[PDB]
Amino acid sequence: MRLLYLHADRFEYKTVKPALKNPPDPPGEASFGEALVVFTTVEDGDGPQTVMYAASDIASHSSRLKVTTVILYPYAHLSSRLAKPMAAHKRLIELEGALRTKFPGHVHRAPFGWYKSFSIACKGHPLAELSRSFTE
Amino acid sequence: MRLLYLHADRFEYKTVKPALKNPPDPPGEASFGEALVVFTTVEDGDGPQTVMYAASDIASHSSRLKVTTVILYPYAHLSSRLAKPMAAHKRLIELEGALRTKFPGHVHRAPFGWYKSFSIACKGHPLAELSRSFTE
Numbered sequence: 308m309r310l311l312y313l314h315a316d317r318f319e320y321k322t323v324k325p326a327l328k329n330p331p332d333p334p335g336e337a338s339f340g341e342a343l344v345v346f347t348t349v350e351d352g353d354g355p356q357t358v359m360y361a362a363s364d365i366a367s368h369s370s371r372l373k374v375t376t377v378i379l380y381p382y383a384h385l386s387s388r389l390a391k392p393m394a395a396h397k398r399l400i401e402l403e404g405a406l407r408t409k410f411p412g413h414v415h416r417a418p419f420g421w422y423k424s425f426s427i428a429c430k431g432h433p434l435a436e437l438s439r440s441f442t443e
Numbered sequence: 444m445r446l447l448y449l450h451a452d453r454f455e456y457k458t459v460k461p462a463l464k465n466p467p468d469p470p471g472e473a474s475f476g477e478a479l480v481v482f483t484t485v486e487d488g489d490g491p492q493t494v495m496y497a498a499s500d501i502a503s504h505s506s507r508l509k510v511t512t513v514i515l516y517p518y519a520h521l522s523s524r525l526a527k528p529m530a531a532h533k534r535l536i537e538l539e540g541a542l543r544t545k546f547p548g549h550v551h552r553a554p555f556g557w558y559k560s561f562s563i564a565c566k567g568h569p570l571a572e573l574s575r576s577f578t579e
């Protein structure tokens with residue numbers, strides 16, 4: 308699993324066209340104030356142990372940053388060892404579930420299987436942009 | 444070399460704190476309308492052949508998108524096989540130079556060696572977010 312952590316002042320997205328023949332989530336749009344935005348690429352070896360490590364790390368980082376909102380943003384573009392779409396969706400659902408057991412704020416999982424527009428204002432501090440790899 | 448291509452409606456950044464003991468570029472800030480924003484991670488094996496392939500691809504993609512501005516945005520976070528900072532700066536300077544021989548619009552290379560804030564409004568169309576790997 309490959310993650311990009313962006314500490315944002317604000318974040319918003321809208322689904323536009325479907326990117327899979329049948330997207331497993333309904334279309335939608337949402338906008339947020341200060342949040343940790345976690346661009347999340349699910350990779351072929353990812354299982355429940357991987358999900359648990361990512362969830363702990365996201366919780367830990369969110370705590371460091373004093374953020375109370377996390378956005379789990381499905382993202383196909385951070386790796387060249389992608390999990391298949393079905394498996395990726397399952398892991399992202401597991402990741403959201405796991406994160407809620409570790410982090411007490413708003414957890415928003417954006418819809419999987421869509422092209423999206425988005426806007427982000429990303430902070431400039433030294434810990435505002437980080438990437439993470441998790442495996443088992 | 445690992446690149447992320449974001450087709451934006453608008454883009455802006457500001458350098459904030461230095462991220463290397465001596466950043467090789469001066470601090471600054473800039474803002475843009477519609478542009479291809481190319482988050483660019485220079486990797487250990489990257490040489491002039493790699494730079495030339497990336498430059499051709501960026502030019503080709505920009506042409507497809509009908510964009511007339513490209514932003515080469517140094518980014519440390521797309522890979523776990525980073526080139527050293529000196530070498531990375533050199534390759535990014537080469538990449539800007541190479542791109543200008545292939546693409547006729549505005550080419551902006553953002554400063555290397557800084558933490559930056561930024562904002563982006565990324566389009567939602569199917570070719571609006573892509574990643575690319577180049578090697579030699």
Ligand SMILES: Nc1ncnc2c1ncn2[C@@H]1O[C@H](CO)[C@@H](NC(=O)[C@@H](N)CO)[C@H]1O
Binds near residue numbers: 381382383391392572
């Ligand atoms: N292995 C994977 N890890 C994370 N997300 C994945 C995935 N495989 C497929 N997706 C999702 O399907 C859309 C089309 O690839 C993807 N959409 C996106 O990457 C949008 N942000 C594009 O605008 C994403 O929702």
Ligand SMILES: Nc1ncnc2c1ncn2[C@@H]1O[C@H](CO)[C@@H](NC(=O)[C@@H](N)CO)[C@H]1O
Binds near residue numbers: 485525526554558559
């Ligand atoms: N191998 C590499 N490829 C591309 N850029 C690289 C690099 N090694 C160092 N940099 C630059 O140094 C700043 C601190 O890592 C980096 N700064 C950034 O990644 C900012 N956008 C953070 O806000 C970047 O300017």
Ligand SMILES: [Mg+2]
Binds near residue numbers: 334335336
């Ligand atoms: Mg809508």
Ligand SMILES: [Mg+2]
Binds near residue numbers: 457458470471472
């Ligand atoms: Mg300034």
